[model samples]
Target: MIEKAPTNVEDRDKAPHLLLLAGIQGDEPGGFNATNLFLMHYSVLKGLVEVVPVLNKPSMLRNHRGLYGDMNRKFAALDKNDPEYPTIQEIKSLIAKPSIDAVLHLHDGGGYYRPVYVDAMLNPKRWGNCFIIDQDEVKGAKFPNLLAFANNTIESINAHLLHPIEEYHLKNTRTAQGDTEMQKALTFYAINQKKSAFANEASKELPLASRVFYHLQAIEGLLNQLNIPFKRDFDLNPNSVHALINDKNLWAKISSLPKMPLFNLRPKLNHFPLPHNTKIPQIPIESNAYIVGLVKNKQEVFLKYGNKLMTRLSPFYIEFDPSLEEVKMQIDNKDQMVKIGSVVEVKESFYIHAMDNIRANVIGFSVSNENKPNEAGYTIKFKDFQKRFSLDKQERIYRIEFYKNNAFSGMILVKFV
Candidate 1:
């Protein structure tokens, strides 16, 4: 059975020494082993310290198909009253413990040597630094003891684990290494990005578990070298292995070695487009109801919707007749307006006429009709026209232009579909 908190809690103000261990899940690569090792080692070394490991809810790992929703973000509003709130309530209870001293959140990075330790609250201006270390170290803060302890622990770990890996890369290759060696510790308040722990396929590419174990080993070695007495659990802790020679000075000696640049392994795209259901319009209109308008301010209109416009063509204009009920229906409704931004479905098949009387089948199109009379004009965008037509095979074409202002666009005779 697991140990439970004391029934009668002592005043936290009386005893002010606590260390916190935080992570997303126990099964995650760096969550349990890295945090547990540190907590156990610290407790064994410093008998007076009360170490608390706050395990997040097993369900926090469920959302986004186990891809999204960071468990770390729940700290802002942890409620002890609700039974559903297990992780948050537990953490709050731990902090309220009388012997709680400091919070040490153990986090895993995507790369081997990259460590981002966040201790302080998130704030932009005060903690705004491009490098990782600058972000982690709470500069000019009131909490000197907290900062000192966190930085010392991080520095010791980095020197032992990160430096050795970097040294190995430096000696093995002459090429520029990527930003894998970047280390940053930030006040949690200074972080601009939402506080969430992410576990994705991309993170799995890194040597995270191995590097964490290496750091744990080094930390244990340091503790032994300093004559810190600690209970060694051989099976559970990776750092419980027999002690080796103290190489604390080795990091400084290899500081001058040339570093290698890191490169990202690009993923291959194997999936190709497959046939999907095509949209059909619910209503059909007579040709007599169609109204044509000239392009007045195409440039201004394109600039207004620049970001939403996906096609290569720019300054494209549309003309339409507002008298049509379909056009008026969309203009009056705000929700319908969004639907018109992309594509408009037509019940009957339509042909796109190019220059020289050549035409291609229209697969899909969208009509944008602003309600106001002065701004009333329909912009028509087309897609999937390539399915029914093909470009010249012998010639290389960079771009295709469509002009429907005065004359139809020119077309080189080719067939597809």
Candidate 2:
């Protein structure tokens, strides 16, 4: 039941209006990810651009094509009882808007596209690496010559081909000529309303960064053709795209768990602790990211981002210690009193000042018979803990949990340089 509010970037009233749509299907992540990338960096100077970056939230999270069925097919006629009804209605209404001049739908389709039979991957049947249009024209629409617009986009993408065989082509589905599947598609629905809707498919055969690059090229081409002025921060190149997509800045700051970075987390972290009898925390995620808590055997809850498992958090029914606010610690031999959820940087070693009725457990560290249980009062070095238990891929981050009166108090992170 989650839907994103359309992002509006406008500078003047007289300029053309374009609608950018992505994530109609979930498994096609290139389009959704690229759309978010555009939103993060671009600024419109003349025209109004409305973006629905992730249209199908659930499908995107599950990394599936659709939850109810193919949502693209449901657009022509959706039943009220159908789960996809609301989404269909939402998009259809947006397309029907009189001010919107044109629509661009993005997706990552299968295989390469060729007009004649080339092979299994490169053939007439393939849908990827192509500019798609329902027909040649849409009467009364702003950009009525769909063929010209599609050709411009295809040419723009083909100019920067990663490989000679990876060139883009124009595929007119000719939905009006009795193509049943295309007739029920989203672009066709817009065509029925006399609105020009252009779609581009990046080949799924290529890597995700390449797919995103092609999608962004198509968007810029279409936007240029419409006389919409805009600017983007990053250079449109493969290396830049790859680096941006692989960034490690993502983190989750929610009420349920202490502040933690999500980057490079183990695929299936187990024995994490959480409060009992509480529903999942409503944490707002960054662009193209999703967090979900899945229950196993009606007991253990696994927190996941998309299909990748983040951690399995066990419930703690005990009351939290509110009196314990902050702890005293020596970070790199410098004394400092740090608050809960704070991250301390360590170069060589660190030590925690032991307080009465409090016990500390540094995760991934083995307690010897002398130290017994408490991790405090010990000068811990970089090599003291197991690297696999570190929070990040660099094996530099470790959490220190504090407990008072046998009740969980708070925690902090130690990052080793």
Candidate 3:
């Protein structure tokens, strides 16, 4: 319902023209900002090409129930008989207006790298058309100046902003596999209902709106620099507008734009090198006892801290000596220890300290107690083991050594610091 002031016929006859298709609802805040910037800049031209901003569904801004469906998806299948059909009709009416030249659909992409203009229709055979194109001149077209004009405009407004067009190129990746499309559709529908039909919460931070408007301003600015004739108008309708320009509350709402995290937050940390020339701890054969049991079935190992079993570790085969067995026996006999199913608790002192080169206090061991053994080895269940250990909070490092008849066969290290 927002309208613009009537353009003078004399001025309209003298300037180059274009149509701006603002995909508002689906676009993010950047898209809206970009569109507005363009309109505002174009207004200064006074007597050159006129710019128009169209809101596809004005009602959707307020009492949008989504019973009608997504307005963007209905572009090609607009039903004339529907209650919300007027919005589509209005756009068609605008497109047929005299003096309109090229159409620029203002929208936001996945990131703040560049502006993208997708083909109205999806075509798979033409791979080149599927790729994102920069604001360049169309080959052999009458409007050679159009591309140059767009480029100059972009440069003037966003000189430092690098345009990454390659990022938008469509790729042939896997989509929904089979009948899961319905499930996905339902999930999306439920998510939308929790917020708004347009899902503006997720898109309020995008730069699409702002970029589009900026480019439009750039175009108009370029035209002015070239001394092209243009006409400008600002349609201020009190009925259609809900808020005043200086309304504090409205301004505050608009000012609360979404904040996004900076790209490249930090570089990945490399693993620490092993202590240089450190001697391996010797195992005392006399006092330090070893247990070798073939894993006949799945088993769980629970590690305990204080009264709680912090974590559990399940392995296909586990081997432990007498030192680890003593800790397990203590946990099994203590009724006060947190009862975490059949998984036996391992003492925390046996593992190495993360901060200093010191030995841990307690260690626990679990051996294959299965009635039936397999050549491929038994499948050990780690559920109880996982429940016993606090994987996130506590800092502990552990090494598992496997033995057959008291002879070392294999080993694995587990640590979290």
Candidate 4:
């Protein structure tokens, strides 16, 4: 729910206000990731862009199309008790705003959309690589010729197609003419409000980077059609878009703890200790990252970046020692100090520098000869630890817990790359 204002607007009301939305269906990475990349780099020079990067965050956490239900279908008539009722009301209110000139709802649909039946993947039933409009016009509204605008945008998108098979087109659902399914959609809701609305559906069959690239092109074209000037920092290409979406600096934090890196994490982290009664972890600084705790048979939380699941954390609650802030470590025989809740990359082997009154417990490693209580001050290799005891599914990332007199002090994540 962030708004980026133009620098040159004298009268804000006169300047066109565009409502950009994505992530209505959580599984659609093209929509939300493209919107997020735009949010991160684009600067509007002459008009305001109100961007909603993730519309259904709950569904996003679980990588589901819609956690509760299909959110896109519930925009028309929402019941009071429905879980998405409040969000629907808010979106409707945004559409009702007099300042909003148009709405662009982004999505990732299946297959290549063709006007005629050629094959299963290229038929009229498909909904991909196209600009969707509910009707020909929202008569008397600003930007009323919805069909024309969609055509213009589609033309621009098709001009820069990555391949001939991925050509873009305009799909007019004709919701006003008894299209039952789309009548409950977001675009139709906007049409009923007399606001110009359009949707861009990128093909889910393509790679995520390719999908995002096409969506950005469509967005730029729509903005151009509206005479809204803007600028993007990165080159509009699939390779660059791939790099943008696969950003490696993604991170998250729990409660007041330092942000821990989520990039390159294994699929599942088991029995990770957390502060007592921790409910939700916060994703600070990274707008694309989302963290949510879900209770199904046990307490497990997921960390996600856009639509991709970074890792699943299963935690064991413990009271923490607040005194110890940093830990001394020897990574590949090189001495270094790492802050608490930080991750250290180990190439081959590592050793934890022992501290008085503090006992280090490496989660996956055990001493074969002695039944020692403390497992610190020893050079440990990757093969010394059992694979199943490792936190992540790859068995490369392990946890080193530091305890002060039986109370959890802090942790240092060791990733054996």
Q: Give the per-residue lDDT of model 4 (tens digit) for 90-113.
A: 988988788888999999999999
lDDT, model 1 = 0.27
Reference-based lDDT, each prediction: 0.27, 0.76, 0.30, 0.81
- Model 2 TM-score, all chains together: 0.80
The TM-score of candidate 3 is 0.34
User: Could you report the Cα RMSD, in angstroms, for every candidate shown?
Assistant: 22.9, 4.3, 24.7, 4.5
What is the lDDT, from 0 to 100, of the residue 78 in candidate 3? 47
Where's the lowest-lDDT run of ten residues in candidate 1? 252-261
Question: What would the per-residue lDDT of candidate 2 be over residues 1-417, giving only the tens digit for each residue?
Answer: 222222453345556778888888878878887877777667777767888877776776567788888888887766899988877888888888897888889989999899999889899899888999989989988779999988987788878988988898889988999999988888888888888899989989888889989999999999888888788889998889877666566566534335566657665554455544555433322323433324342465545443345655454444456677788999887998988868888899999899898888888886775542787899899878888887766788887878776577877888887
**Model 1 residue 190 CA deviation in Å:** 14
- TM-score ranking from best to worst? 2, 4, 3, 1
- Candidate 1 C-alpha lDDT tens digits along 219-290: 343334333344544442223321111111111100111110111101110111111231111112111100
- In candidate 4, list every pair of residues with a backbone clash: none
TM-score of 1: 0.33
Model 3 clash tally?
Answer: 37
Compared with the true structure, the alpha-carbon lDDT of candidate 4 equals: 0.81
Question: Which residue pairs does candidate 2 place in steric collision?
Answer: none
